[PDB]
């Protein structure tokens, strides 16, 4: 859409309806009469539009009201509430902007933020934006976390996030305007190359893709129509359903052949029966000829019984010849009906070996996207975020994604090389205890009104703990952490002195000889300016390949590309890097996925902030002091940057509502 309505859409909001959240803060309005609601909505959308139309400078309440024209211009509080509301929940005035109104002289409240991953940074900025004192602690010696980028000479390649999954309602679209990201479309053509080194024929490439896509809709049918969702008390995975669906197709091929050949016999037997009739008829004919022959040898003139005997035998004989000639006809038909049935046999197989290896690629690709074996994905829920897909094509960040977190860390109190070991929260406030990554002993203590945790899910799952909570986290949180999935997927970066591949083609596949090996180096990218080829390890492969020397892994790559591009066309690489995200202790994996047995709900559980018990018993209910953000907290945008930052903005709004109060809710 375009107009004001397009601003709403672009801010992930229904242009013609009040959201649940807005209802919470404008309960007067939404319970109010219909007329007023349309006003509100317009104000919001218009205000949004304004922020969007230029996101490089702060949009103030004044500027906003200037551009309103009554009947909407009239009510100045409504405009103020609405503006301040959007301001609070990072719908406007987020990211990198110039600030019209310099900051509150002194700062209210203190927050410690664990992790300088985008979620963290986006919060930090937002809080400081509101005039709180913020300090982030990062175990790494660099911001971004899972926005890692590699730099050396003019070689540049992300090992972390790389892609913006459409700009249509993506808040990263706004950041793209505030920061120079060299955004390139991705040419979606990807040709596959069997084990030997040979492109798969266009003809097959399509047969299998279609079957792959067909098999997927199939699984969804099982789930949502046949309710095939539990097996022996345990919940069904995507992997299982796919096997079942596949088997069922194999089975249906057989059932068809059976029925066909079985239709052949039943006609073959009809022939047998007929021929018997035909042989016995010929036998009775044979003798009946002789009889007629003998009878006509009685030379005339003759008595009438002997004349009758000739005549009668003659007719009795033509009567049988008649019968036999009709059966010769009936036979003719059945001998052809077997030409037909021999000619059109149902398919020999469901899938050849070749077919199934290529199909395994398309599955690897799914294991790539979701960074986990299909064995582990919830059948019911793995694709729950598919409704909130952005529009527009996917783009890579050509200059390296690290440009974004860095940009956010301008003017922020970040303590790098500071690893949190324990978080203490009580009704009075919080102590965070970190150390120096370099010399573990050099110990730090931080006190604050609130902590915001952006620790990755893989870290939260770590046993025994890398971080202690004091008091421990309630079971409802820890159970959700157990149920959630935390996958893995690695990148190998190959740096060369010359482009020895088709520059016209951004990406191109390789087809592993096994099912158990489909993930290993199954996909290659050239998306960058320099001669850099990127190779992916996905699926069950990823976690195993983390126990192999880089040298070897680059070996296996080079081999592949020789086979594809010609043994002498493959120069050795000047520079190589291999990712190991599951190994990485500030990550312990790549990103969340909806494990079988979990739901989207767990994402909400993960976001729920934590409230300590009271200090003195029978003292009033304390405020909540421990907050959570990051990729695993946002139900509708999991495992992405936009989700991280959206969670970041979200928590910042929530914290501010707590510690600064929200005078826009009246």
């Amino acid at each position: 859409p375009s107009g004001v309505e397009g601003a709403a859409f672009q801010s992930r909001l229904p242009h013609d309806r009040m959201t649940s959240q807005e209802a919470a803060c404008f309960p007067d309005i939404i319970s109010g009469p219909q007329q007023t609601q349309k006003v509100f909505l317009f104000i919001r959308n218009r205000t949004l539009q304004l922020w969007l139309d230029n996101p490089k400078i702060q949009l103030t309440f004044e500027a906003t009201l200037q551009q309103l024209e009554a009947p909407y211009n009239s009510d100045t509080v409504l405009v103020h509430r609405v503006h301040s509301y959007l301001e609070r929940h990072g719908l406007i005035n987020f990211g990198i902007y110039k600030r019209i109104k310099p900051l509150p002289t002194k700062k209210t409240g203190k927050v410690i933020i664990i992790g300088s991953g985008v979620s963290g940074l986006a919060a930090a900025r937002q809080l400081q934006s509101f005039g709180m004192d913020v300090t982030l602690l990062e175990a790494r010696d660099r911001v971004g976390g899972r926005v890692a980028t590699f730099r050396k000479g003019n070689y540049v390649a992300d090992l972390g996030a790389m892609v913006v999954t459409g700009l249509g309602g993506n808040p990263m679209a706004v950041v793209s305007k505030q920061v120079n990201m060299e955004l390139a479309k991705i040419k979606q053509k990807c040709p596959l190359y069997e084990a030997n080194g040979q492109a798969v024929p266009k003809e097959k490439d399509e047969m299998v893709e279609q079957e792959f896509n067909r098999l997927l809709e199939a699984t969804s049918y099982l789930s949502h129509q046949l309710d095939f969702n539990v097996l022996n008390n345990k919940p069904v995975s995507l992997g299982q359903a796919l096997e079942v669906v596949i088997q069922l197709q194999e089975k249906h091929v057989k059932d068809e052949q059976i029925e066909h050949w079985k239709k052949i016999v039943k006609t073959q037997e009809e022939l047998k029966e007929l021929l018997n009739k035909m042989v016995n008829l010929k036998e009775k004919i044979k003798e009946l000829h002789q009889q007629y022959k003998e009878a006509s040898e009685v030379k005339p003139p003759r008595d009438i019984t002997a004349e009758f005997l000739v005549k009668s035998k003659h007719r009795d004989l033509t009567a049988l010849c008649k019968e036999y000639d009709e059966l010769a006809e009936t036979q003719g038909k059945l001998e052809e009906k077997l030409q037909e049935l021999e000619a059109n046999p149902p398919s020999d197989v469901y899938l050849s070996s070749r077919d199934r290896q290529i199909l395994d690629w398309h599955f690897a690709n799914l294991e790539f996207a979701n960074a986990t074996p299909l064995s582990t994905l919830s059948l019911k829920h793995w694709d729950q975020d598919d409704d909130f897909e952005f529009t527009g094509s996917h783009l890579t960040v050509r200059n390296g994604y690290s440009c974004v977190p860095v940009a956010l860390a301008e003017g922020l109190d970040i303590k790098l090389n500071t690893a949190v070991r324990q978080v203490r929260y009580t009704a009075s406030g919080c102590e965070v205890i970190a150390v120096n990554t370099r010399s573990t002993s050099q110990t730090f203590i931080y006190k604050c009104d609130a902590v915001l945790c952006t620790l990755p899910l893989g870290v939260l799952k770590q046993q025994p703990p890398a971080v202690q909570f004091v008091p421990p986290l309630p079971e409802w949180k820890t159970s959700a952490v157990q149920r959630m999935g935390f996958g893995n997927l690695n990148k190998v970066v190959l740096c060369f002195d010359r482009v020895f591949w088709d520059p016209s083609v951004n990406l191109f596949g390789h087809v592993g000889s096994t099912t158990a090996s489909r993930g290993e180096l199954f996909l290659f990218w050239n998306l960058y300016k320099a001669p850099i080829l990127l190779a992916l390890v996905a699926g069950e492969a990823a976690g195993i390949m983390e126990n192999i020397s880089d040298d070897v892994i680059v070996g296996r790559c080079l081999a592949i590309l020789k086979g594809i591009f010609g043994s002498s066309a493959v120069p050795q690489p000047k520079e190589t890097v291999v990712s190991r995200w599951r190994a990485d202790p500030w990550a312990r994996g790549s990103y969340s996925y909806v494990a079988a047995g979990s739901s989207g709900n767990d994402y909400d559980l993960m976001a729920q902030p934590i409230t300590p018990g009271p200090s003195i018993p029978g003292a009033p209910q304390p405020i909540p002091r421990l907050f959570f953000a990051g990729e695993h907290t946002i139900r509708n945008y999991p495992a992405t940057v936009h989700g991280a930052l959206l969670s970041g903005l979200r928590e910042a709004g929530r914290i501010a509502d707590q510690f600064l109060g929200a005078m826009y809710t009246l």
């Binding site: 098999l215 199939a218 096997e243 079942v244 088997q247 249906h252 021929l275 007719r315």
Partner: protein, 133 residues
């Protein structure tokens, strides 16, 4: 509420491939055999019918009799009557056959014959005798 086209999935088979841990390969192996079973039994009847075909070689063409074409006639020769009565005796009511035999009398003429002559050729008696067979 419908599978993608050419994908097959009914409630019952789903249950059937799942219940056991190998119920899949069991069922798929049963059919594998149950096929080769029918494939062989085709070979039987092929070869059986191949030998029956060999016995019929020659057709019936050596035993074919020429075509008689007598033009229907109203009169009954004394000869023709005699053939009738013997035919009645041998054939009963297959009036077609009786007409075929006499050579040149319509099947109606044959039927009337029973009525007009029944009187004198005891075609009653004659017919009981055929019945007794």
């Amino acid at each position: 509420r419908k599978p993608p086209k050419g994908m097959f999935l009914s409630q019952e088979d789903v249950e059937a491939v799942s219940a056991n841990a190998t119920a899949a390969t069991t069922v798929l192996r049963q059919l594998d055999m149950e096929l080769v079973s029918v494939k062989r039994q085709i070979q039987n009847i092929k070869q059986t019918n191949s030998a029956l075909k060999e016995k019929l070689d020659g057709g019936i063409e050596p035993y074919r009799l020429p075509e008689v074409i007598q033009k229907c006639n109203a009169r009954w020769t004394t000869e023709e009557q005699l053939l009738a009565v013997q035919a009645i005796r041998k054939y009963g009511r297959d009036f077609q056959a009786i007409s075929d035999v006499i050579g040149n009398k319509s099947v109606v003429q044959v039927k009337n014959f029973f009525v007009n002559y029944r009187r004198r050729f005891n075609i009653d008696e004659v017919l009981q005798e055929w019945e007794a067979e």
